[PDB]
Amino acid sequence: HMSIHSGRIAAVHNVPLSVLIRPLPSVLDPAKVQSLVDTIREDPDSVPPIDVLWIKGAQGGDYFYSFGGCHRYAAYQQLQRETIPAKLVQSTLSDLRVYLGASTPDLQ
Ligand SMILES: Nc1ncnc2c1ncn2[C@@H]1O[C@H](COP(=O)(O)OP(=O)(O)O)[C@@H](O)[C@H]1O
């Protein structure tokens, strides 16, 4: 075998909900939110980590952007949880511009 696979680093962490930037509105099915609440209470390991873009700014500041995972995010909030399991996906400002376009911040 001549080759390896390489990609961005992703690691699951229990991230404080408060650190997550959520620039976009959520599209929520209220019954699906409640279903997740029930599942988180009874069987949390069956609820996957949400994906979060981990971006480092020009001066090394860390920013955690959350797009999607709307139902899980809402369900953790309704449970008043401090943290949520999240896959932190190392990403760039170019990756961020895909979601934020002209409003993409010059992050520091
Ligand atoms: N009761 C549940 N209702 C919906 N999704 C669930 C439930 N329990 C576990 N899951 C898992 O959680 C993830 C939720 O994904 P999704 O339905 O796209 O909601 P969101 O991405 O908006 O949080 C899925 O991978 C699904 O398999």
Question: Which domains, and CATH codes, for the chain?
Answer: 9-104 (3.90.1530.10)
* CB neighbourhood size of 3 (10 A): 5
Joined together, the tokens standing for residue 101 give: 């376009």
As a whole number of angstroms, the distance between CA 48 and CA 25 comes to 21
Q: What is the secondary structure of the chain as a DSSP string?
A: ---------EEEEEEEGGGEE--S-----HHHHHHHHHHHHH-GGGSPPEEEEEEE-TT--EEEEE-S-HHHHHHHHHTT-SEEEEEEEEE-HHHHHHHHGGG-----
As a whole number of angstroms, the distance between CA 21 and CA 107 comes to 13
Tell which one of 47, 50, 76 to mutate to probe ligand 1, the residue whose CB is within 8 A of the most ligand atoms.
Answer: 47
Specify the experimental method.
Answer: X-ray
Whether the Cβ atoms of residue 62 and residue 54 lie closer than 8 Å to each other = yes
Give yes or no for residue 42 CB within 6 A of ligand 1.
no
**Alpha-carbon distances, residue 73 vs 6, 8, 20, 53, 60 (angstroms):** 30, 24, 10, 15, 27
Which numbered atom of ligand 1 lies nearest the CA of 70?
Answer: 22
* CB neighbourhood size of 58 (10 A): 9
Give yes or no for residue 68 CB within 6 A of ligand 1.
yes
Among 41, 49, 61, which Cα is nearest to 105's? 61
Among 23, 8, 4, which Cα is nearest to 73's? 23
